[PDB]
């Protein structure tokens, strides 16, 4: 049968042009008052998945 996407991974990662994945940073859901603005501002933009993690992501998203 067809491989099934890990649906939770598909809600967290999106494939980019050269075939990497973008994700949103952790640590910006709550407890925000104590965090420095600089810290928060740097968590806002989407980041790329790291080399060590790509294998895991790719396995979860066979149709990405």
């Amino acid at each position: 049968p067809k491989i099934k996407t890990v649906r939770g991974a598909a809600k967290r990662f999106k494939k980019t042009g050269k075939g990497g994945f973008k994700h949103k940073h952790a640590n910006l859901r709550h407890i925000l008052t104590k965090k420095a603005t600089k810290r928060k501002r740097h968590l806002r933009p989407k980041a790329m998945v790291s080399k060590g993690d790509l294998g895991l992501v790719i396995a979860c998203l066979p149709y990405a």
Partner: protein, 144 residues
């Protein structure tokens, strides 16, 4: 050229691994699985994403975004595709007839990709700035 003088290309046919057929093979005994543990076992191995119990990457990161329904019924047209329609009038229906866009596409954008030599009349589609230049340069016209 006989049934017993035909040969495959060199390198086209590699023999598969046969595990557990003796020392000489290099895959005898454990068959490449090493010694013991979950991964040596029949049916063994952990599921996709599992990292030994540490919160997996796809769970410690937040969900984001939503899926647009409008994106599913929107398409992009290359300049190179404008010549493939019939009649030289590029509209939504002529693009479908030419198998350029899917049947359920409602909106289409012509983008600057490839070249357009012939004059074409684009009607009803959106057109990028660069594509507008290319179409008008080729003698075409864009109708809104």
């Amino acid at each position: 050229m006989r049934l017993n003088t035909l040969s495959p290309a060199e390198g086209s046919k590699k023999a598969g691994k046969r595990l557990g057929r003796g020392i000489g093979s290099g895959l005898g005994k454990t068959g490449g699985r090493g010694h013991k543990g979950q991964k040596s076992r029949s049916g063994g191995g952990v599921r996709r994403g599992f990292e030994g119990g540490q919160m997996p990457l796809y769970r410690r990161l937040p969900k984001f975004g939503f899926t647009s329904r409008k994106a599913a019924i929107t398409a992009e047209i290359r300049l190179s595709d404008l010549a493939k329609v019939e009649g030289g009038v590029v509209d939504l229906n002529t693009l479908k007839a030419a198998n350029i866009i899917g049947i359920q596409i409602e909106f289409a954008k012509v983008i600057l990709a490839g070249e357009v030599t012939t004059p074409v009349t684009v009607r009803g589609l959106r057109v990028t700035k660069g594509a507008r230049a290319a179409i008008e340069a080729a003698g075409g016209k864009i109708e809104e």
